[PDB]
Amino acid sequence: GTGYDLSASTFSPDGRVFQVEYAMKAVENSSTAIGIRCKDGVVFGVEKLVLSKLYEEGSNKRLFNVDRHVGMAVAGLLADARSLADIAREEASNFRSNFGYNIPLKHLADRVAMYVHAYTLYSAVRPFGCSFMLGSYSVNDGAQLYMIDPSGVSYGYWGCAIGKARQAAKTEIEKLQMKEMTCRDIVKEVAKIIYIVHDEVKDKAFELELSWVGELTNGRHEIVPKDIREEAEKYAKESLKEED
């Protein structure tokens, strides 16, 4: 439609808020980010497209620490993604202040999702051009992974993908039996899927960002160390020849 697509305070005749849909297209044009729920935690992998070799490694970091126990992986307009991380950091900080313990991930997902939803109702502001995945592990709650989109919908996921290769990444995840496998295993298979769905012909070269949270890390969202990342990058390259 045209005429009805300028403001988030305006429905179209078909019953659609095109400003929210256009914010989701900025995510669909952005690069692929994925994450899978293991037995003993959650792992994140991101296709970070290098615009120039002039930039340092660990610049434009699309993986973030929201809390000590929670990890955020983003895809879309990156400025909006960082401000969403700042919202989630403060929102998690408010829970610790109010209730004296670590925020549950479903609650953290819901409270930040309603922040995202608030920007889809008014002419005065625009939606966030960003989908992101929140992931966590705990003693009692266990492994949990949630994804939020520009509209403000929050669902829980065993496996999830957002970006260029949204559909293409998901059919590769469906092959893996994530429920039985562990975080130690899944880092190889997450690194594999990024290398598959990466278009070498269209796009430039890329850096694989890997983070995780699990029993391995004592429910703490850390980066995957250079020992394990480079093992998984090696596994990705050599097993790409095995199906080519």
Add this chain to the structure above:
Amino acid sequence: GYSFSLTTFSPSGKLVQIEYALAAVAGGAPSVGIKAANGVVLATEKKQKSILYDERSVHKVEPITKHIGLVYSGMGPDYRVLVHRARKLAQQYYLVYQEPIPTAQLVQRVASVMQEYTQSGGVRPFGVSLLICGWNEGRPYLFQSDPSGAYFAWKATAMGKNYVNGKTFLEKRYNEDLELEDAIHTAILTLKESFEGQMTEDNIEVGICNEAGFRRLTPTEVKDYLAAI
């Protein structure tokens, strides 16, 4: 928010959103109000789309305080804002003055609120005309108030679908010292002109106002008046 009027003057010199709001009233489910010598009647069509609708739940004919009542034609949600506000305005008078609010004065206060949304920032006016029954010194009162925020004291009138037919029907058939028995019967006959279906205790709603304040009539009380038609 938006700090500018959505209702504005056209080259002809007409506040277009008010006349468009009157079209929303004019295409609403019809409503009638009649002033007897000893009392006041308010009646309206409550014909919902299915038998699935619980008839006892929500009401068109609503009280404001113990001596004033209310009914509408047009937009239902807009009406409920005016009911809540009118109820507050009644108590704000009673708290200050320790006297039951005059019906004229309640209409004037709600009129001022209805006028507010024809000028203030970022808001359309109400798609509602109200009919306000009452009892003050020792005598009946009936008032209309329409989306403009203008108000008119009526002996009798109609609203909604076939309001032109209801008004002419009433003009010839209304007498200026009717009994409240007869006026309740007249109000149902005014609705039966514009009706599409067989009438019942459920699918219409009536309230009355007299010496002992305002109340909504029960289904069985209505059923007695429906028996002799």
Add this chain to the structure above:
Amino acid sequence: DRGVNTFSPEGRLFQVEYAIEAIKLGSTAIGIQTSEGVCLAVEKRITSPLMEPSSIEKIVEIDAHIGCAMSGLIADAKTLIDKARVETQNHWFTYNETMTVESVTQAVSNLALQFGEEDADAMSRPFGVALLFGGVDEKGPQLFHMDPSGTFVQCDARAIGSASEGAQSSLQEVYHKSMTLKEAIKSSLIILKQVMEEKLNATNIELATVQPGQNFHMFTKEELEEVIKD
């Protein structure tokens, strides 16, 4: 129809763009920086002999050591001149010293893009005014230009107004860096007489100078009539 804080595809604010366009309508003014002093000259553009000539103050005293010449919307300028005048005496109050010509110009340059609609108390549009500051501080005699964007820079010589384009070509040929003040004063009145479609005289213009020894002085009828010669 669009907002005041809207970029063009070229990458610049429409209202700032159009504020530069407003200075072309304004009457021309020249300032020349020399080692012996900064002179400042401007045309009054008198539309009637009934209009009192002395009450068109287009060069004004900011302080005893600084002046400012203006072109464009004359009313818009008086807001900025007063804010500069306030800033200098606020600085004198706090620090017991004179401001530099750069420091004053910067303070006025901070106000240039302080406009907008939503999130405001405040200005709707920019100031459609170019200012030629000219004074003498601890770093010798200095002349500074400012435009509606907020861009400000030191100038050896510069002009602004309707014949800014025409006068700058004449300044290129005429200007020499080791010249005297009295040569620079007479240079301006030569360059002004050409561009004015009215004829140059003591009532039709304002001149003013600032030296190291002497304060800001605006020239009288008698002092202008002596220079008039050339």
Add this chain to the structure above:
Amino acid sequence: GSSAGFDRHITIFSPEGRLYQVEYAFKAINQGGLTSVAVRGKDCAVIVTQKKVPDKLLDSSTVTHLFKITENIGCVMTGMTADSRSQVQRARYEAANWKYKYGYEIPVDMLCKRIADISQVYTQNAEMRPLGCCMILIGIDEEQGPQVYKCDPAGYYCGFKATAAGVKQTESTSFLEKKVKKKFDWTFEQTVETAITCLSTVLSIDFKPSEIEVGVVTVENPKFRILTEAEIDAHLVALAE
């Protein structure tokens, strides 16, 4: 369908007296691609909707349109999921705040009225759109017995003997008005099975346990019970004949 000014872009009147932006919020309920049904028994009240899990990679527990507002009250949403969650958060706030201010359990009509009055503000003020969603509340009133209460994006609300909302609303309300006219002893079994068969025969699907989700309140257990897939399986096989 006459139009002038910005009447299709913002919530202001058309020449006919309609609000086109309100009407478009009703079309936005259908975009979810789901239909909800709600039914009132003699001693209970039940809600049912499609628990559509196309992706196996979803956690099917977190996929739900049934929500707990208080202990004694729960609702089914239908429409835009972001709007639906947002309207549920506000229902929880207003319900809790009622118990703080007034010291008793909010009744089901007043919670539904409160949300409907909030929806009207969007219906009148141009600055924001209406929420493209539809809340159907259920709960046991102490005086009045069990209650079913819908409210629209327009700001309407009403009590119902049974109701539906979503894609196949008109077919579901057509099915329910046929069955309500016939006499039944409206027990917990009668009320639940009418809701599932209404949603089944309208959509023309024999449901499995994972393909639906059921919420309910009885006279004996008035706390908001969301039935498990095992409990759903018993009612489906009861309709084997």
Add this chain to the structure above:
Amino acid sequence: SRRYDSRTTIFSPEGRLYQVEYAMEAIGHAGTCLGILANDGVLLAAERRNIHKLLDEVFFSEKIYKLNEDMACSVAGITSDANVLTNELRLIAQRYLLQYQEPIPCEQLVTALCDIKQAYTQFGGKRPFGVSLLYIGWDKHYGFQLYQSDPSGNYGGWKATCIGNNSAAAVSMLKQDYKEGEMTLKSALALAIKVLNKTMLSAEKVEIATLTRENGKTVIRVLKQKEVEQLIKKHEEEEAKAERE
């Protein structure tokens, strides 16, 4: 937001305010409201647009509003806008009285409302109040007074004037027949009914009031339907008596 803005408070290219002019066109459709000054009093006479068999007649007036003890006014335009403005006029009259302990002078009360009406034309982005008012009053400075105002927030003092339907036709008719310094309230009442006979004659359709000073205190009273109907028959007889001769 910027797309949806009507922009009520701006100059059009000609050098004028559209919503102010368009509001004065609304007044030109509304009922014929006039006022006439005299030596021994002031009057207002208005066309009564609320005319039906089934109307109740609660209030002492319909278009006429009392403001202070020594002042009153009538209106022409949107009646809801008039109820706001008249309420505010009454507030101003008492705000002056609380402050000084004298009645507000008539020009001062009119300027106070007209400063508010002008604000709605200059700022706020709001539509103006679509009402012209005719004011009557007495004060210790200028005595018997008549004022006109309009949606712009502009006012003037008049000996006799009109607003509403057939405004210009009524003023030109008043310019013929009004004699300055020589008019009493009885002669003014004859001219009021003469002009309303041209523009609009039953007494339900007419509504008159007379401000006068009797025994050191101002007396504002609406005329009853017996007083109006006898004045209508006096016009009909005086019109017919000239027609024969």
Add this chain to the structure above:
Amino acid sequence: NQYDNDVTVWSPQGRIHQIEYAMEAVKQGSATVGLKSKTHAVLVALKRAQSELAAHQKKILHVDNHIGISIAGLTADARLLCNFMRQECLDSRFVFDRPLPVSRLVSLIGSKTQIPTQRYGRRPYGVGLLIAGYDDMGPHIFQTCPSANYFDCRAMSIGARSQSARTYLERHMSEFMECNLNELVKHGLRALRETLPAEQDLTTKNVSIGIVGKDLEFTIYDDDDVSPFLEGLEER
């Protein structure tokens, strides 16, 4: 076109044209280059003169003892965003008695400049910065933009004809980390004049340098100050 005027209006392409228009303010603005070694961080700026009579435009600004910047865009947004950095630095020296980490300062710029891109009747900051600074993690070059995105860098260039500079820098990356100060400044100067045409080249009037490292605070070099650095290699 419909999606050009307001920052809140998403295009059907999935783009915000008022950001992308604000990016063009940097590009039409003058050229400037930034790079770092193991020990130092250097900024080099081609100062654009208005006319040949008027003095050259100030392109490198001071923020703290440990941070300074070079600009490209609207000078008022440059000065506004400079004062924000100066103040957040001042807050950190006041509160903690310790210089503000450069990555943390750069994060606050991104947070700040993002705010108006999402709000109606507001605009992005029409200015791109190259931010040189030294801290506990050694020297840094950071980039910022109107889009509120920021980049950690080995080196960078921005402004008019800055593609030429970026091509030069991408070749000599591994050289920069090993270089001494004089070799690192000379590298940045060669990247800058690659943006210029063959007719005109670097002089003491039209070049400014800004240097910070382990030994030195953020010093700025403009006129005779620059003369030591230029006199080394000058051909092509």
Add this chain to the structure above:
Amino acid sequence: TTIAGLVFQDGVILGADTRATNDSVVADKSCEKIHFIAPKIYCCGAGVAADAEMTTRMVASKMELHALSTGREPRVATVTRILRQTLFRYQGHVGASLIVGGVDLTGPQLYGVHPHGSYSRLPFTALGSGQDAALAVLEDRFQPNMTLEAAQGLLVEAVTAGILGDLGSGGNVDACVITKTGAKLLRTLSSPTERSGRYHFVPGTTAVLTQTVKPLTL
């Protein structure tokens, strides 16, 4: 002031004296301290007379608003909550000591509400300057589930003990029985205490300087 309350089998009875004192001088002999809140909710006024007056006025209006909206007879827990949270915000400066009594859906209910915003649900209570005399009478002879006749007699005896015993308290016993079927407002239920007078001055004994007569004529 002596005000008191009492829960019995079919309902609640609320008692109050009629004296209103200004310092140590009797201003009013006959005044109603039992105020209307709802049809089957009444409230006794003690402490600062204006604060007792205006809070009970205000909550009555709030219950009328609440009842009209709900379409239900109001709960006695709701009046207590509204009073508390009003009174708590003002930190006891609104000095209204109140006994709130009524019947609703959940049975007969009596609440003591103090001016700082504390409350107590009770079967019997007393407040005001002669609370102790009335509360002593209640402790001596209260039992659970009294008759309508015995409760009136006990509650009259409680308020009477204050009337005689407390210098602040005086005059008649007003009362209010709130059964299930409505509320019976027994004003002047008792009169514990029972002249010559006549000081007829002749017209003209008072000397007069000015006289003005303003006739009115309707």
Add this chain to the structure above:
Amino acid sequence: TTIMAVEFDGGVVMGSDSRVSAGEAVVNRVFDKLSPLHERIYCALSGSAADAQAVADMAAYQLELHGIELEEPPLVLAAANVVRNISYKYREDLSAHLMVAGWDQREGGQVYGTLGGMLTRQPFAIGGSGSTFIYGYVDAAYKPGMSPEECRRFTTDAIALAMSRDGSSGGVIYLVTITAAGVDHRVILGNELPKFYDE
């Protein structure tokens, strides 16, 4: 006032007196000072009644909505922090001490003190005016690993000993026993109080 909470294997016992004083006058001799915050979380009210109730109402309101937002029963650490933060924020203005205790699926039976906006988990705690007189007894008589019945005995003995000595404490002993199974409320009357030396 005398209040007391005690911790054990899979639950907490929680006890108060029943006297609301106004100097030498007893305003209410039968006041329940154990107010519910959630289904399995109580608090023992102490100090200013108006202050103590208002915090309990606000904590109950906050914890009701917090519980529904998680789709779970709130933690006792959460309810202890809700009471802590209110008491701390308005510590100058309020003059009350709300001892909070209950049961969790996570950490089980637990007792927290919130004296003047602090927070501390103890195996037992005591509060109010009458707690002064029984610090010796609770130190003497407490040993770890008590049953529900041993805790109910100990809470009754301590509060009865205080009620004997403290003028501001008196009336009946109200008792609450919170476990996974539920909440057992019980009222030990003034008739059947455990006798000690009282001369």
